[model samples]
Structures are given as structure tokens and as C-alpha cells.
Target chain A: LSPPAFRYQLTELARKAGKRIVLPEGDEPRTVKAAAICAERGIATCVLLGNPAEINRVAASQGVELGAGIEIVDPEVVRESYVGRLVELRKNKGMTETVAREQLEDNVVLGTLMLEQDEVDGLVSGAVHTTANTIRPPLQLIKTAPGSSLVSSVFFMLLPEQVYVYGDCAINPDPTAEQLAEIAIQSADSAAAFGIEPRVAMLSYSTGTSGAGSDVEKVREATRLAQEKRPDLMIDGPLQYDAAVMADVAKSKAPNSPVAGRATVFIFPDLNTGNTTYKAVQRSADLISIGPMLQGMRKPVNDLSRGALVDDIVYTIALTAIQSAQQ
Target chain B: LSPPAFRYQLTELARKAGKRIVLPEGDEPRTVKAAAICAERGIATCVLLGNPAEINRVAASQGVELGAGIEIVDPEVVRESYVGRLVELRKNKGMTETVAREQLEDNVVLGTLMLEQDEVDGLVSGAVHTTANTIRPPLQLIKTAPGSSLVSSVFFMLLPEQVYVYGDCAINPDPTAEQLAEIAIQSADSAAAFGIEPRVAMLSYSTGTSGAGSDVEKVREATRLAQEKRPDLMIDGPLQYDAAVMADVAKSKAPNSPVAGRATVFIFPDLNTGNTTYKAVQRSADLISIGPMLQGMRKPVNDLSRGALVDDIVYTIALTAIQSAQQ
Candidate 1:
């Protein structure tokens, strides 16, 4: 669903925080209009990335108000500085000045730069660009937050049982044991940001270690990694999902496992399972899945698929506000 | 949640099939009590697994009539041939003849033999034994069904939107690509058995093609493998769950995907994710999740975790009966 009539909640929440959102490269009209609506309604401040005159002309032509707070940062003017920065970041990695310039021609990088310079708190891209193109610049330049080794994505599921975070749904696909361990720890950190105490489950096919395979090994290893890195976080795994969520199931199957049936953070073995499974739950469960919110980044940045609706933009704005407040 | 107030309809449905539910290993007092409830209301026939003398003793003491048509299979007397057969099967697998005899001192073997010999349609165990113990003997001796490599679990979710199935939540934790592909195909087959067209989604973190990692590769490969194995299945992946069920998201994330937004079957990468997430969805969605309905078996043999309630058994009975009609 497109959030239908419930879309205004994001604007209301963001307004309460007094945050500002910036949209770059200007191509998406719905996203821009929605942001502009929020700005006019005093939900948040707004900025657009494009040629100011063209933007105004289009808004005027479409009968959608541009509003007073809107600012456009044309990519043509910003590309020079960006290509230079990329040249510094990737000097020895075969990215020449010309190649960097061509890549930054992408609006996602321009939006990312706005966040990097503190011109904006966060960015929402991928709506008009491939996830690679949307994420590459920030990944290369912003890198991971200090003390975090790997980056992942988490969807904040507002389910009836309570909200939970499903991790690595956006980033690492089929992560190694060490990588899943990193994901578990990082997801816990994300959960904490949402005021959740993380009972992390390293999900697997078998409960109580009955079956053996790469997936189980990955989950077991991830659990080991989490214990090594964040021993204080209650984590258990190589347990089946039933054991992870149902107390009785956990008690009977695992007997002594700490996190089974009580897990709040679920770390996945691979994206295929994680992404597809979560979406099915979202639809079938009639639950709200908030993000593939970018995590482990020095600053928060999100990518939207090209077909994102205004509701997604609205929610991401609130999300950006939340991340900004966290910082 | 348990299917509320639908017991009448279920009991009614069971009567139409002339089904006989055999609860092997429970006392006649318990069987008579349940059978009395069902018989008073026109459900299927009920059979208990106990000696007639012991059953009559328990029934007489408990003041319940152990009625006619309540068949009893005494493990001590009737399964000598079965004990011998299991001993032979376990001969090289480290089980001594004495051990095999002791293992079947319970009646799960007799119950399974009942299924093999058409004395019962399906066998659900794991009440008095560990899950591994309950399911192990059947897997080794009864073996997988004709096309299935192994028996997997399927959870049928009658969600708000529609019905979907998640697989291998019972067995096969971190399946190989071949295993996942097989699970997807089998789940699709199961869906068709229930009259669904079987649009299957292979879940992953990355939608379409982006980023290469083991999890992502496996999901991607599984989709290909499933297609290769069952080209008739409307399968697509490296999709997220939302992308699979939400039309807009699927259209945006995977524009040309056939299964996007309409998938009837979902395959997870591993057990932990597959299980916990499905249960979460079931709890939160307020839907009826039926079974870890065992698939890929030579015969329809299912097991209950120690925590399962009477309702779980009832649903499993219904599912097994339905599967028998289709298979």
C-alpha cells in the first residue's frame, strides 16, 4: 500500500523535531511536491537539488507550489568540487578525475555531498538511480561509523507483537559468520536508537543445532562474533525462527539458549531469505516496514528505489529527522 | 493465533471425508475424551494407541466411555514386525537391536507403520519424544517422497491479503542452492495442491542485480535453479518481502519480475530467519498459520514440537488430511 491517507504522520512527527530535509538532483516531482507540502505546513524545512529557474518553472507549470524555504543546488555547479573529492578518496583505485566527474553526474552523489558537508542531515536517493549508484558515493567517502566494521540495512517493522528490526535486508547478501556477527552488533545499535533492548537471534534452519550447513554455520559464527564484539548484548543463534520467537518452542528446542523466542533483533544469513521473507510478512502480517535504513555509515543516508511513492519520501523524511536527532 | 470458533466448521469438514484421526501413543482416556467431543459434534472418527486392557482400565477409572470405532494399536503386541524392521534399518547406523527395541517401546514407529500400511492417512508425533527422535526414525526408514530430496516444512498463512507458504522452517536450515530451489518448487507444488498458481519469490537483501555476496548469490542462484527445475513455476527473485507483496514496491524494485507483488510461495535462505519471521507475521498479522506441514517425505509424516497445543494438532490433522486428498 502507498500509506494512503495515513501519510501525514511523518510530516507531523518531523515537524515536532524542527528538522530540515534536502532533496537533490530534482528529477522526482512527487517527492519534491511532498517535501514542499511538508515545508509549507511547517513540518520541516525543504531544499531541492536542481537549477532554481527550471525548478520554479516546472512547479509553476504543474500548479504545485515551490514554497518559500526551497533551495536548489544545481549539480553542474557542485560537480567540480565533488569530482575533486572523489579523486582524493579514490586516487590509487583507478578512479581518475574524469571518471569521478562522470560518476558524480549522478544526482545520488550530489545529494550525498549535501549530507557530507552538513548541508543536510541525511539524503533519500535511489528513487531515480540504481542502488549501486545511489549508495556508492557515500559508501566510498562516508565509510562506516567509528567502531562499526560493516554496513547493513534494517527495516523497522511496526508489528502487533511489537516493533522489531530485521537486519542486513538491504546490504550484505549471504554474509559470512564474521560479517553476520558484525550485522548483529550493528543491528543492536540501530535497535537501541529506536529505544529497543536488543535480544538478537542469529537465525538458522535448525534449532538446538540439529542440522548443519553453510547457513547454520554462518548464523553460529555470527553469534560467536556478536558475543566477542558485544558480549553485553543478549544474542543466540543457529536456532530456528520458531525457537527465536516462541518462548515455549525455544524452551523445548534449545532449553538453555538465551535469546530464543525472546529476540527483538533478527539477523539474516542472506538477503534473498531476509528480503523476501520480510516483505511477505509485511504484506501478510499487515505490518508497517519502515526502512532499509542505511546503518553503519558515518552519517545516515538512504536510497529509494526508482518507483518510490510520496509516502515513502514522507516516511524517509521522518526517518532522517530521527537519525539527525540521534546524532 | 489459533483459528477461533472455527472448530465447528473443521469438525464438519472432517465428517465429509470419513477421516479417521489416530493419536498413537496416548491413553484411551485421553482419546475417548477428545473423541467424545468430536463424536458428539459429528467430526471424524478417533483412534487411540493403547492396549485394550490398559485403555479400558484408564477409561473405567476416568468414567469415560471408550466407544466403538475407537481403534487401538498396542505397540507391545502389534508392532513386533515394525521393531524388527527398524532394527534392520539401524543395523549399520550404530543402533543395536536392543536399542531399536527400546526406542519403539513407545508407539511412534507403530503410528508411522500405520501410515505406510494405510491404516492412517498422516502421522504427527513429537509429543512424548524429542523432535529429533520423533522425526528421525521416519526420515531414515520411510524415506522421502518420489521427487523430493528431503521432507521440508511448509507454513500456510491465511493472511489479510491472501495466502502464502514459507518452507523448510521445520527441516533444512541453511539449504544449498539446490535445496532452496527444490524447496521453492515443492512449496509451489503444495500451493497448486491447494489451488494456487504458485508465483514464488526467492528472497534476498538486494532486489534484482546489485552487490554480490554469498547470501545474495545463493538467493539469486536459487531463483535460477528453481526456474531451471520447474520452468512452469512463476518464480522470480533476489527480491525483498515487501517487493514480493506490495505491488508498487515490486514494480519499482523489479519492474519485469513475474512474481513480484503476487507471489504465493516464499522461500527463505535459512531456518532462523524463515521460522522467527513467519511466526512474527502470524502473531502480528492475526492470521492462521497452519503447519510446519512436512513436505518432501516418502509418506506424510509430521511432528509436533513439544510446545504444540491441541489446536496445533487439530490443524495439522486437517492439513495432513488435505495433503493426502491432493497427493
Candidate 2:
């Protein structure tokens, strides 16, 4: 269900920022309408691509007024002929020239390319795309350093008192211990980037060593491996969700664990449990869930799920700007 | 290391009930002081079963005024020449008449006799007592119904808003599949004794079919075995603690579970983990842990540890009153 009210809230926040927020390459009426609300509220925006006339027509049909002064780029002039260069870079891989061209044709892929080439400050594509479809192209074209796995994501929970990160819920279906280890490390790194001192708890059914089982064993192994790989990190595991977050449960079940009762980064073992759990909390607590924030990449990029509203696109853009500023 | 505040709090609740609390005749200053506290509050008289002068002197030296109305029953008066009964009860168990006489001198045995003869409403004795010392006499004299197995226990947690029960923490150490089934049934029966409707969650390291290890399989089998043996009660498990208690986790992990996330009775797998976990919570969260409430007996006779204080005596009195009043 669409939230009862989205634009008014966005306008409310944008008014406080006291600056024009630009939505580059915005054409979809929903996206433009949100961008228009920002404009109407005197929040500046520069929509960098698409025909202004068609965008206006769509906005009018949708009962949204283009309040004025939103910039649009000439798509024809911005169209790339550097396909040969991109193919050349990936020619050594199994992909043929035609395959490379077809893969790069996706707007999300092209937008990422523009970001890499410094054509735009940031890119947000997953709003109209699947997580894999939106992020994989950028990952392949602008690959991470060797040994880095697929780009995973996290949702920045900006709780009233503090913020924490919950990760890999959207990426992995059932991550193995090794993948979970990677997630722990990556999430900790992300927390550090977001100025949250990471206290990671690898969640499981068992608290410490009350009982030993495969799930607890995997979490124990992953925590051990993650610590072995990055000893500087503060992480503990084989704990339940409450024990990780609730102080009372922690002091009782996992007394010796440093991250036992106060985890700021919660790494899940698999997505089936993870994604569903996060959304449930998000809806129940009425929390402002920031970003399917992309992590484990060379640079930060945020994704919007296909079901996201236009207000979500603007929020992602702000998250990207703040993230880029941090780096 | 001592929880003096909790001890005091329990003392206050007991004092409000105006219930007579009994401790086996002993010279332990700790138990005597608890008795004095009960007297000071005008809750009830605490009776010590022993020679009155010895009890009075110990009370005086400890600076614990053994209030005027307290009862001090002499064991010698009650157990004088009671050896033949003990001899008859123990003949089949290979105890000689001489050994039975020697065992008959024990205070716990004397105390059980008091309960059986209705000399006292309840007996609380484990503090200066080992659990064996506290329970064995009752087990032998107040033995099970014809075909019943060993006696078990349940801890009734009276939270500020709700009450949940945790069982077998005091009695069984490592209960087998059948024993777990028995424990579950007994714990639920215990819950019903209070106002709580039983919803038992057989806790495990796994959620549903996700993982299967020794502990998981044990709980899994116990859940089914419980179903077969006691279908009228709602029970489900091999579920993590969160799924058993937290509604969010319960809905996501095991939506079909009747007891999932809404459990009012928790059956732990063993004493080591179960006792430690509940004790930790009781001590840490400031929870009111009521028991070592013995179960599976025809009568509601409970045991207190050797170190059982005056306040525990009060609760055992309350529990015994509730049990007897209902029946």
C-alpha cells in the first residue's frame, strides 16, 4: 500500500534544507512530480535528461503541476558513442562485444557509467528496477578490486536516538558462513563510514554456548572468521535478535559478549529471514528506513526498489549526496 | 554477589499476605533474619521447626528479633520414636531398620511428615539444603502416583503485565525425549493453576525445518511427542527464542505455529542452560522468579534451597495456598 501521504512529508523536509535539490535525468511523472513539489517549495532542482514538454504533459495528466524552473538535459546530445571503449575494457572477459553492448544499454547501467565518468554527482536507478538489475551492471562495468564479492546492501535505520545498519537482506537469499563473514566486515566498514562505531552481532538462535547447533555453529564460525580477517572489529554472534538489541536479554544470555546486547550493525545469515524481518520492523515501528544503501563497492551508490514512490527517489538522492560528501 | 534488594522485595510481598511461612528447624541466622523481617512487616508468623530455646538464642545473637508471635516447633516432639514408619517405607529399597532410624533424624523428612499430617501448610527448606536434601524426603514419603515418573518443577514468572512459566529448571538435569514431553505437560498444567492459558514453545536453535542438529532434533521430537501425549495444549518448537517470544519474529519465521511468538510457557532443554538463563533474567531484569515449585505430586509440597531465605518461605506458602485453595 502507498503510504497515506508522501509528498507533503518530503516538502516538509526540503523546506528545512533551504536549498534547491536537483533530480538529474528525471522523466517519469512520479519522479518529476516529486521533483516539482521540491521546486514548488523553493527547493532547487536540475533534471538533467529527457524532453521537458513530454515530462510536463505527463505531469499534467497525473494531476501534478510542474511549478517551474526544473532543468532538463538534451538526451540526444548526452547519448554516448564510447561503447567501443567500454567493450574494450571487458573484451578479455567471456562477454563478446555485442553482449557487452546489450548489457550496457540499460539506463541504470548507462547512468552508472555517467557517474563513473563524472557526468553526474550520483545515480539512483533501482526505484524503477530490481536490485540485481540496477546494481549488477554498475558492478560489472565499474568492477570492485579483486577479492571483493558482489555489491551487497544495507538499510540505514535512523532511529530517533541513534542510527544502525541492517544488512544483506536484499542481496543474498541464503548466504553461507563465508558470505556472512563478508557481510559482517562490509557492514562494519559501512557503519564506520556513517560515523557509527560498529558493534556487530551475528544473529542466531543460540546465545553464546547455551546450545550448539549448525546455525549457531555457522554464526560462531563466521564471527571467528570475520574477527580473524579483521581483528580490529568489535563483533560477537550466535545470538537472538532481542539479545542483540535489548539490554536486558544481553546481560542475561550473553554476559561476556561485547556486542551481545548492543549491536549497531546486525548481520543476518540469510535473506529469507532478513528482508522480511527488516520490512516488518520498518512498518511496525514506523521508522524512516534510509537507503537500500549500496556497500562493498569502490564508491557509494543507492538503489530504489521497483515498488518505491517518487518521494523515495528524492530521499535516495539526498542519501547519495551525503554519502559522497563523507568520502 | 548477594541480591539483598530482591530479597527485601520478596520479603515485603510475603509480609502483605499475612501468611505463615515455615522453615525447617535450624540455627541459620540468614533464614532467621528473613523470619524477623516477615514479623516486622506484620505479614505472617515464620515458624522454625526445632528446639525453641536454641532457635531463640540463635535469633537473639544474630540481632534478628524473632518476633513475639513466631512459632518454634520442636522436631523431637513430632518425630519421637517415628523410626518404624521410616523402616517400613524403606524396606523394599534395601534400607535396614537401623539405617531408616538414622535417616529419620533428618529435618526434611520430619518436615514432609508435618505436611502429610497437616501440621503445617507448606515446607521451604533448600537454602541450608542441597536440592537433593530439600527434595528426596518428599520424593520418598510423598512419592508419585502409581505409574508416575520423577517429580519436576516450574518457575512461574509474574512480570508486571503478564505471567509466563519456565519449567524443569530445578528438577530435571538433562531430560530425555519422553521426559521433555512429561515436563511440557506438567509445566502447562502448572500454568493453568495460575490464571494463565498455556501456549508452550519448545525452544530450539532452529526455526522450523531450517536446521537439524542434536538439540534441534530433541526439541523437535519433544514437540511432536508433546502433541501426541497432550494434544489439548498448544505446543510448537524447534523455534528460536525470539520466534517463541517476539511476535514479529514469530510471524516471519513460523507463521503457522500456534504457540510461535505467543508462548506463555517455556520448556528449556536442560537444567544447566535453563536454570542459568532464568536465574540470570530473574536477577538481572529484577523479575520475580517464583519456584522450584515442585510438580507431579498429589499434593502441592514445594522445596526451597538450603540457603532458602525467609522470603522464599513466604512464597512457597503463597504457592501452596493457591494450589490447595484451587483443588
Candidate 3:
């Protein structure tokens, strides 16, 4: 199915659960419009973090009807209550109450604080802010989920026939073998969370023992570790992409591999491969790719591209809500 | 703009040129079939390297007519003549006439020697052989072309609307900066030979300075080196795939780049990226991908999957023939 259909299914689940999703970019027309649509569709309890007066002005200028469909939290009010909480979270980093209050001036930080305090189920940003500015607070305060050594990302590559998960595309450029193994485990979990069966393929340039190098060795080691760590997860590599996905090629290249030709979760060896491959597939095949969804985070916090459209924002919010529900 | 049309165009080009192309796997059904088709269609002067009696028997059993349309050379005859020549070329590497004679018993080595001797314009193999077995002879004997530091491979990704050249997908696992520059230069040359205007994109996880690390730095250095090496060539990167190909994304991410959003040739950072990306796009988008066509070789030598279909072999042969004619 297409991403929109897949997203609709997820949205329905999120709607029934009725989670709260906070939009940090309240000034962005697309974000405001997405929030309105989410609220109107009953997809979530849509919350916008900004000055209420300014958010109203943006909504009116954009010809969007608020109609009690969304909630707007003024950063001024949130900073008053959240500054102490932020200081407490960042006290180890020598963050004082004064610095925390100043940092909370940024609406993304305020929205992340809301997510931290259970006031919002999730936080979505990066429409008007850099990725660092959007996720830094959450990374510092909310932190990685229990047992996750690091946070990674995954893209849901929605092909005509199926949805595959492509992980660590937007974060962690050069993960070590241990980190790659962790990414595989987390990606499998992400795939399963999205209702996809986790047949993980640890992607590499070589299949079986066909080629050898440090990179191949790394992928080989990572695959071994991932399988060892999660014995219930079906995983294999270092597999060439064709051997991982094409049944005929798989049979020829890796005859005994269970994950080959039937992989639902593809863990790229590194970010260079992951990012380039995902974007190439998205454009070359005109497939809908939704994410860089941050995985292993304690709570869901997704970032959007600066040029994300209204529909893109809406779907990202829906994804965050679903992740929150799944958590 | 479909792959068939692209294949037809290549076939017509090869037909007009009538290059001598050798098939190393003379006993394989697909190779024999491709030989017959190439000769019958006047795509090339097809030469099969094997025992004539064995090839004929196999052809007859497969219902393929070898009717004076193609030439079959017995390796035994070539071995006697080429052994001295091979020993002369590899004497410094501790080669002897005895060693050369034994090596020439392998059809791939003999065919590569034929190319080295200018007896054949191209060599195509690997239907029943491994890629290393097919390309290793050429890599060792004929060697890289002048000014080419290393051998690489490119895939002709034939989408519905256009064709893109994806390079270094098969051969290199992790290339150095200088090697990546050489790949870019060779890929550009390959693109130009295939009737594509060469706009090369050195792909990476990051676009410009959007991201960082050793990998990104490597690609950035490669891009600079490639541009410096070939000022006449249109090349730009360390670009993300979307920034390299999508107009809107390119405008936003790499606004000043002339090649961005218009790249016909994409040089991936490493094989993990190239192999995975090519297969993902090929299978996910239902696009036809041809080759892993070897580049920077002294003469055109291409490898095939053991599972290659009859049509795939035919097209590969045609591609090799076209490359031969161009060279």
C-alpha cells in the first residue's frame, strides 16, 4: 500500500487512542494547518506551542478556522512552570534555572518539555528550526529509552506493494559495529511497531562470503551481534541489496538465508548508504517516504524537513501520535 | 523512455558498429543463446571461447542455432599462442610459460588475453561463473586504462522517463578520496559514451555542509578533486540524493550547483550505498537496471549474474559491444 493509506491506518489507531501531539513550529503555516486538520479529523489532541495571539493571527492570515479544534500554549506561560523542570533534567550538565528559563524561550524546547512532563504525548518540530534546535532538548531531557544506548532514525519506504523500514538515514553517520547492531535491533522494533513483520536485512556490499573488507567485516559482525542480542528476530548479512530483496537473486546468492528476499526491515551499514538510498528510492520510484522517525527515544519526537508540506506535517504528527500510543 | 527503448537504441548502435565481442562462458545456455541472438541480429561479431564440439552440443540441446552466425574458439588453440605473450607481460610478477599455459586453460583468462592481444573488442561472462572469475582476468591482464587509477562499475538505471548512471556499485567496497575522484571521472566518461550528457553527482549522506564526519569529508574531498581533475566535466557534490536529483530539493539544499537536480551520473560514496541504492530503486520502483558495467578497463569487460535471464544476457552483450565500439 501507499504511504497515505498506511498513514491513514495508523492515524485511525492514533485517533481511537486520542493522544496529545504538540507542534513546536506554531508560526509555520503548514504546521498550524496540520494541527487544525488533526484536531478536526480527531487524529489527536493537537496542541500548538506559541503565543496564543500570534498563533491566532497566523491562523487567520492563512485562512484556517481554529474552531476549538486545537490548543495553543503560550511559551511565556510554559517557561514559568517548565524552567525548574528543565533545570532539574539538565542539572548534571550544569544547567541553572536562569539558563533553563532562557532556553525555554524557544518554543521547540517548551514543546519538548511538555512531552517530558506528560502534558503532551509527543513533540514535532524542524519546520522552522534546525534539527539540532528541535531535538536537542528532548535528547538531553527525555533521553533514550531504557536499554537503548543511543537514539537512531528510520524511514518508512512505502512502495506500491509493501512498506519497508530504512533505519539511521538521518542520524549517526558512522556507527561502530556495536552501534549498527543496536540500530538493527531498534529498527526491527520500529518496523514491528508500525505493523510490519521484522525480517531484518543487514545491508552491505557483499553477500555471504562473496567479498571481504573492513566494511564487510563490520556488517558481518553487526549481524552476528544483532542476532545474538535478539534471537527472536530473523536477521542476516552482510547481504547485497539484490540478494536481500530479490527472491531469485537471493536463492542464487544466499540459498539458505531466511531473511534474504523477504526482508521487511533494512538496516543500512552507514548513514551515507542509508540517506542516499532512501532518497534515491523515494525520487526514482516516486515512492512516499515518511520519516527519519527518531527511534529509541523515551517519548516520540519527530522532526520535519523545512519544506515539508501541510500533508507532510499532518502525517508526521499522526506518526508521532501512533509512536506515542505504541510506547 | 522505457528500458526496452533504451536497449533498442543501444542495440541499433552496436549493430551499426559491428564490434567483436567475446562470450567466455561458451557452455552456459544463456551465454550461448545470447551469442546466437547477437550474431543473428547483427549486434556484434559474436565470438565464443570454448571447445567447438561442446558448445555445439550444448546449443543443440538448448534448441539454439549456431548456424555460422558466430565463431567458437577452442581455448587449447589460443593457449599455445598466448602463453608466451602472458609470460612476457607477467614475468616480473613471477610468471612462467608453464604457469601462463595452465591459466589460459580457463576461458576467462584466454578471452581476457584475446582482448589484451586486440583480438576482441569486448568480453562478457559470468552466467555460470562468479564476478571475480569473469573480471579478475581483465583486471590483472589488460589492466586499467591510461590515467585511470582503479577499475569501477556503473549501472544504467532506466526509469520510465530517463536513464541515470550509478557507478562503483559492484567493484569497490570503500574507496579512498583519490579513488572516488577517479570513479567520478570514469563514470562521467561512461555516461558520455552511453549517449547521456554527463552531469555527475558525487553522492553522500550530506549536501554541502549539511552534515559532517570522516565519510562526508571524504566525499567532499573527492568532489573537489574530481572537479579539479576534470574542469571540462559538469560535476558537483557531496550532495544528498534528493538534492542531487530533485529540482525543488536541489534549489533548497544546493542552490548554487549547476549539476544538482540535473545529474545524469551518480557516483556513490561507497559500494554499500551504491549496491543497496541501485537494487532498492530497481526492485522498489520497478525500474530496469542494467550493468555493473566495468569502467576504467583497458577494454570493455562486463560480468553477469548467474541467474541472468536470456534477455538480460542479450542486452549485456549489446552493451559491451556498444562500449567496444565507443572505445
Candidate 4:
């Protein structure tokens, strides 16, 4: 099915599951409006992290209402309760109770502790914070899922005809061959979760034996390792982006590749390729792209672009809730 | 203007100059057809490198006529005269006359030698050969231009609204910071040659200080070096592709930057990023793309994709001829 259809399906699933999603930027107009939309649709039990009075004031200033079913949380009130847990998660890395309490002045850090304690099923931030500020606490507190070796991110690029998954676009600068394989696996999982079939293409500069060098070799090795790791998954590469996505190009460059022209999940060789490409397509084609969603986490913690629209936040919340449901 | 307008400008410029361009894959149907088109349009004085009888036979068998004003040359007929020149060029690598004579059997090698000797203005091959096969001869014999430190490639991505130049897409897998700067300079030159005013964006995952890591740092350093190398050129980075192309995104992400949102020339940090991105925008948006046109050469010698259509080859020939005129 198409991405827009799948997006609706996610909303239905999230509504039935009644998952809780926390927005750390409580007073941001987009986040507040999105929280109201989610609550109105029963997409999630929405929590806005800030002073309740301040959140209402901002929403009023923006001519919006937080309405019924949305919860407002102030970090100052919850700071002391999560201090010990934060210290426990980071003690070996030199965290103390006092330091943890002080750090909770940051809403993102406070939200992570809430997710860690299962007070929220998912966390979303970055509308008013940097990615590092949004992700640092989750990485240190909730950490990676059991079998996941590393944390990565993916963008769901929505074109008019279909949605494609582009992964590790926001994290991992120069992943090694093994790390590349893991990213492929993780991206495949993400595609499947979003109702895509998950034929994965491990992208590089070369297609098959057409070009040579260490970068090509790394993609080749990553493809082999990923195939071994998930034999049931359709995966192939060292395919150039053209070979991977265009049928005529695929036929010419890689005639027998099952995943070549039908890949829904595109695992980039490194962050440079992944990030630049996702944005290039997004801007040049006027396509909507969602997430640099942090994956391989124990629980869902997604980040937003600081420039995100209200509709973007709504979709992100639905996505985060679906991830929480899957968990 | 738009890409289609810019494309017509190239055709007009090439026709006016009437530069000589050599096509090495003379017996390939697409190559033969493209040569006929180029000659008929006077885009260039076309030279087909092969046995005249064989080229005509192939054209006849395919029901394609090699119309008037196209010249053909056989490598076997020209090998001896160019052997001394080849030896002279490659003698530092211990090339002898005998070795040069044998190497000239390959049409690409012979074509390169012809260009080196000013027998032709430019060379285009690779419809039936590998990129290495088409480029190796020129790299060895014709060599880089006077001040160019490395040979790179740029694609003229013809989106519906505009023409954007994406550089170093087909070469230099993991360019050093300095090499990236050189690529930017060369790409700017390519853009200017094609009637596009060069507003360059040095691309990365991060826009400004929004993200961290060595990849971003590399792009930042390269941007600085490129600006230092050519202060008259409009250049900015480390911009994400969105900020470089989308006015709203640019306003939010890299406000006050001269090149943001108006960049016509995009310099990718490395091959994986550049190659993947050019293809993504081309395929996802249904845009026309030409080149991976090799730059920094003493004379223009471009390699075509094995899957290139007759029209694609025709355009590449025009591009090569225009590059020759500029030189």
C-alpha cells in the first residue's frame, strides 16, 4: 500500500493501542497544536512537557487550545523524582544525584527519564532543541534495544507515488562495513514497521563491478554481511542510486538484482551520502520527508526539525506511537 | 533560466563554435545514431573512431543512416603516427614506442592520442566500454590541466524548474579537504561554461553548527578553501541540500548566507554522497541529468553510461564541444 494509506493505518493502530507520547517542547506552537490534534483523534495519550500555565499562555497567544485529554508536565515538578534514576543510568559515567537534578532543568533530559521509567511510551523533541540535546539523554538513559549494536536514524521520504526509507542520515558519519550492515537491517525493520515490504538497497558510488575502490568494497562487504544477517530479507548492493531505483538503469547495471529497482529501504554507506541525498530529493522534488527518527532504541524517542510544521508533528506523534505499540 | 533553456543554449553555443568531438564507440548503434544527430545539427564536427566500413555496416544493420559531414578514423591506420607522441607523453612511466603502438589498438586510447595531438577538440566514449577504459587513456596521456590538482566529474541535473550542477559524483571516492575545494572550483568552472552563474554550496549533513563530526568539519574546511581559492566566486557551506535550494529552509537553517537558497553549483563532499544524490533527484523527481562529465582535463573527454540513449549521447557530445570552445 502507499505511504499516505499506511500513514492512516498507523493512526488507526495507534488509536486502538492508546499509546502515550511525550512532547518535550510543550510551549512551541506547532507542538502544542499537534498535541491537541493527537488527543482529539485519540492517536495517543499526549503529554506536553512544561509549566501548564506557560503552555496554555503560549497556546492562547497562538490562538490555539490544548483542549481536553492532553497532559501538561513541568520539569521543575518532576525533576527531583527522576534524579535518582538518571544518576543510576549514568553513575558509571560520573553522574551524581545533584547533577542529574540540575540537568533535568532541560526538558529533553526530563522527558528521557519519563520514558525510561515507562511514564511515557514514547518521546518527541527537537522542535525547539538541537538533535544532540534531544537524543543525548535517551542514548544515555534508555539506550539501544537488546540486540541492536548501534543507534541510527532514518527519513521516510514521501514522494507522490511512494515512500522510501533513507537511513542513518542523521547519525553515524562514516560507518564501517559491519555498521553499515546493521544500518541496513535496522532500516529494513523500520520500512516493515511503516507497512513497506523492505527490499533494501545498500547504496554506494559504484554499481556491481563497474567501479572500484575501498568505498565500493565496503558496500560489497556490507551487502554480504546484511544478507547473512537476514537471509529472509531482499537485499543487494554496491548499487549506485540509479541502478537501485530506476528500472531501465537496474536492467542495464544489475540485471539479476531482485532488490535493485524495487528497494523501499535505501541504506546509505555513510551519513554524508544519506543526509545530503534525503534533503536533495526533499527540496528538489517538493516531497514531504518525515523523521531523522532515532532507531535501535529500547523505546521510541523521535526528534523533530526545528522548522517542523504542525502537520509534521502530528505525523511524527503517530509514528512514535506506532513504534511504541510495536515495542 | 530553466534547464531546458540552458540545454538549448549549450546546443547553440556548440553549433556556433563547430568544435571537433570524437566518439570512440563508433560501431555501437546508439553512438552511431548520436554522431549522425550531432553532425546534422552542426553541434560539433563529428569524428567517429573506428573502421569506416564497420561503422557504416552497423549503422545500416540498425536502419540508421550516418548522414553527411561525419568523419571516421581507424585506430589501425593511425597507430603508428601517434606512437611516438604517446611514448613521449608516458616516457616518465617508462613507456616505449612498441608499448605505445599496442596500447593505441583500443579506440579510446587512439582517440585520446588524437586529442593530445590537437587532431580533435574533445573525446566521448563508454557506451560499450567501462568508465576506466574511456578515462584511463586520457588520464595517462592528455593529463590534468595546468593548475588542476585532480580530475573530477559533474552532472548537470536538469530539474523542471532549474539546472543544478552536482560535482565530483563519479570520481574521488574519499576526497581530502583540499581535494574537495579543488572539486568546487572545477565544478564552478563547469557551471559557468554551461551558462549557469556559479553560486556554490559545499554540501554536508549539517548546516552550519547544527550538527557535529568530521564530515561536517571537512565540508566547512573545503568551503573556506574554495572561497580562498576564488573569492570572486559566490560560495557557502556546510549546508544541507535543503538549505542550499529551498528559500524557506535556507532562511531558517542558514540565514544571511550568500549562497544558500540560490546555489546553482553544488559541491559534494565525497563520491558516495555526490553520486547517490544526483541519481536520487533524477529518479525520484523524473528529471533529466547529463554528465559525470570529467573536468580538470587539458581537453574535454567525457565518458557515457553504457545505458545512455542516443539523445543522451547527442547532448554529451554538445557538452563536450562547448567545453572545447571554452578551452
TM-score of chain B of each: 0.84, 0.80, 0.96, 0.95
**Models ranked on DockQ:** 4, 3, 1, 2
lDDT of 1 by residue, A1-327 (tens): 134323344455566667666676474777676677666776667677777778777777666776565667787887798777777777899889888888777777777766777777776666776777767878887788887777788988775446778877766755777777888888898788666788998776666567766656667777887898887889988776667778888778887888887888888777755765676567655667778888778887777767677767767767777666666
TM-score of each: 0.80, 0.51, 0.92, 0.92
Q: For model 3, how does the per-residue alpha-carbon lDDT over B1-327 read when each residue is reduced to its tens digit?
A: 577788888889888778988888887888888889888898888899888999999889888899665999988776799888999989999998889888988989888888998988999999998888988888888888889978998999898778889988888888999999999999898888878899999999889999989999999899899889899999898999988888898888899999998888999998889888887788767777888788888789999988799888998888888887777
Candidate 1, residue A158: Cα displacement in angstroms equals 4.0
Tens-digit per-residue lDDT, B108-192, candidate 1: 7667666666777666566556777667767876788887786788887765445677776667766888888989888988878
Question: Candidate 2 — which residues are off by over 4 angstroms?
Answer: A1-188, A198-327, B1-188, B198-313, B316-327
Write down the TM-score for model 1: 0.80
Error at B231, model 2, angstroms: 4.7
Query: Candidate 3 lDDT (Cα, whole model)?
Result: 0.87
Candidate 1: count the clashes: 23
Instruction: Quote model 4's TM-score.
Output: 0.92
Q: For candidate 1, what is the DockQ?
A: 0.43
lDDT of 1 at B14: 58
Q: TM-score of model 4, chain A? A: 0.94
DockQ (model 2, Cα): 0.04
lDDT of 1 at B129: 64
Q: What stretches of model 4 exceed 4 Å from their correct place?
A: A2-4, A27-29, A55-68, A73-78, B2-4, B56-68
Rank candidates, lDDT, best first. Answer: 3, 4, 1, 2
DockQ of each: 0.43, 0.04, 0.73, 0.82
